[PDB]
């Protein structure tokens, strides 16, 4: 019928899990006006610049005649932001019961300062829901008793109409919706500190990483392009023995080579020892911890905590066969190698095949990345003292009841056989976008992303205004890895990201 | 729209916890007439000296289809003060069920001796609620079994309008609301 | 010819053309006259609002000439006139002297 | 005004370069009906399933009062496909002059068999343009005299309206528009046979490649996932010396490991010779060709044409240090290594650190990819005899006046210093899609893609129904590499892809 059928039916937006353990007064939908709500509108809005009117919002719950409880509805005017307190209720509101099978549908009228709302106006009328009266249940007791879900649909109000038709091509002055970061599919994900695909999650209280990490304003504390490619550096043949300290050749960070690893040696170690031990091979898996016993040991081997990497030797004047490569970042005074945490154009050591005293100079070329030195079960990047900052220290603490995560990756080792992994802050594909794009997100509203395994388990992940990953569970566990994700939008970080995991 | 939007929507007033251990007949809202009810009115009243008409009162409970019980509603005329006894019920009343999801909204009509109510008149019409029939619950037993809450909103009746406009500064003869200690 | 809505700034690339446009020929002796409709966020535009509707022109198809060869072959000029639209009217009458909050046009250096 | 402003103005579609050397009668717009034309419609159509009516088409040329020539317009009914012959004109047509400054605008009325057109119906009314009378120019002479361009816009006809509103989520039965393959940006492109970013184009008459190559029907002659990751194989320690022949561990091709290189040794060579020569180092660049002279030589070094790759050794029972890796695919009868072209679960050789006669077995683990053996200026994959087929031989000859290309990549070498490159068939990101998606394209209509450097140069690339890259120039040259692409749609491969390069 009408060429505007969407301007008629209802589209789903989001839904939340109202738990019986959720104390009186607690926000549930900080959702605000603006065509960013409904997807159709949001899509259509790509062709205009002007919007006005309101948006109807139908939503309901599936309460059982047993339950009892009431939800509140309040239309927050522009310029104010709702707080998760009670006082919010000393405001004209609309009570709402859990039994009511009839889904409620009211409208968020647009009160405006201007005539027409510029696409980007993030300051508009808003509506919210708060648990008036707790959710009671006749068979209380232990654990998270229960709690039903609540959905929320959306339909463009009647009085809602656009206005200014933009001419195609004239780049948008603001930024697209952040619901386009993580790829819907677990397959191609891969860490940002290491080119391996993720295979697990890390529930932590703190997170820190600058190398290849990008901010939401496109800025980056880092020192390297959001991609993994070979590292080409020119080192001046020392004539004596191993040297290090070789400045890069072509990178978007004066000195500090784009692609150069992350951490540094956790102790004033020296460069030497052939196949330096860490004892017992064949004695596979008798070893994790602190060397397990006297005979059997867990860590030494001289150049420990070193980044292994194939490498093509230059030749300058002459002499062949690549041969080595063992790197990191620290000060190379003498034949020692004290660790620096601050990274500058004077801390890039390596190992070589220099040789011959004519003092032939400017050796090598390139080297990649393959492994690292088996420092026990230390998932690289778990301590500030080990992460190398260029100046600043990008991080994030537990905002709201949410906790920060990492992305348990996997890093091959050498001397041993094959093992150990390493964390990760941003799913590579993300950073990639961050740097190449430019969005808009409230410094208090994450970027709700749904994750789901192959059974039923599912949880949400958020994105910090800085660019980190958050979770609403105290601990997550094992789940079928044929994972796939999705995007919801934004929600005040002050609310937990529900999940049906465990 | 109307420069009097408050004279339209409902504002919260107070709410109480109706427990299943609360014996038959027990007051819950000794609340009385007078602009002191709704905050908007109460605030606006600061500019007048005269008020009249009634005030509508919407309020409800969130009962579960399981529960059973009835609440009573009674409009106590001025000059009398409700007692927490049963006999109160041998008076025209309006029964009320815990299941009813529909929130009730009736009015407290202003019966008056005078023409216009002086701001301070603490002797006016009044409304109250009493637990007609206990609150029963199929899974009784030990401790304070359970008991749901009940809210109460307020909206200025239609026939409610002030009257005498006081000139600013002329100190108020009575006293402000104690909700400021 | 393309009418760029407010909040965006035209780039000297091609993609600009994957937008509703109006082709224009070099032969057409008839001078074209269209309007730049004002789409606005507010009700009335404050004198200083530098963020408004906009129009632009881009060379769709190169300028060809049957006698090519060396040097800057040739190339003709193009003019542009202006007339206040009908629906264009002011609104707030400022009282003299009340210093202007913004700044005069730089065409006076 | 109208919430349907697009249903009013005109949108650009495509334009062509009408040359004065273009002989009488030659198609220029095989364009056919269907919302796939206009982008707005095409986009909107995502929400329906039914469309009907016609589409208006405004387009014109910028002819100079000097020129002379006429273009023809013909509305080809459904079920027939226009031929690039003259006879096409013995059909009711509409003549068209080069001088006419007034842009013509007619409609392609929808004649239909059914009531409503199912989204996928590729058999509908169609319109085309053919050069009635050559393009004449008073100052003829040498070279490609001249020739002006012609554009073509589109606007949804009035009588054009959709019909069936599909419910979201119910996966589309057909396939999206192929205008979404190549990434708009030269940056992240990288070859499909090698993980290096492209840096040049190869104008060739023939093309062949199966490994990591995908068809348009999602099928692949290949033997490996459209991605680059380490190759893990288990080889049975021979006890004697070097072995090879080790079956994979986990790949979607029985035997043939996913990721295993492409070509094989071009001669019955053996496994030996330490730093086997190919003479003169330091004698840099005195050497390309056929060894240049007696003293100086260009190719031998025993294990020539071998794929170099770091590799982590297993250990089975015992004994350490990775150490080697040099691979390819051929039969390993004895200590010889004759080349097989046909690849089966019995042709995967390597080099090792087996040792000790207890006959300790099942050695190694993994190995990656770094280099190859300097076979002169041979851009790997330039001869059928060198490319390894699993059974079939995917390729493409010069369809129409168009020529096939490759993607001159870059592959590091060893013994020398650093040099030589290698071809490539599909821009990786492409194959990636091909395998993960499912589109629709006429076996005679490419996928027009525009390429542009940083000056002005620009040309088009097409996609074969099989999945190859084509060009409309006999030779392309050097151009500023800050390249970026785009997508147009589809055009009968029988037409050349114009370009403003050279």
Author numbering:
A (entry chain C), D (entry chain O): 161 to 662
B (entry chain K): 161 to 341
C (entry chain E): 233 to 341
What does the report in the manuscript say about this coordinate set?
The Vesivirus feline calicivirus (FCV) belongs to the family of Caliciviridae which carry a positive strand RNA genome which is enclosed in a capsid composed of 180 copies of the major capsid protein forming an icosahedral T = 3 shell. In contrast to the other genera, Vesivirus VP1 is synthesized as a precursor (668 residues for FCV) which is processed by the viral protease into a 124 res. leader peptide and the 544 res. We observed that the majority of the FCV VLPs obtained from the expression of VP1 in the baculovirus system are small sub-viral particles made of 60 subunits with T = 1 symmetry different from viral capsids.
The crystal belongs to the cubic space group P213 with a cell parameter of 358.3 Å. It became obvious that here was no electron density for the N-terminal 37 residues which correspond roughly to the NTA domain. VP1 forms a closely packed shell without any significant openings. The particle has an outer biggest dimension of 295 Å at the position of the spikes, whereas the shell extends only to a diameter of 185 Å. The structural adaptation to the two types of particles involves a hinge movement between the VP1 S and P domains resulting in a slight rotation of the spike around its 2-fold axis which is combined with a translation of the P domain relative to the S domain. A comparison of these different oligomers in the T = 1 and the T = 3 structures confirm the conservation of the contacts within the oligomers.
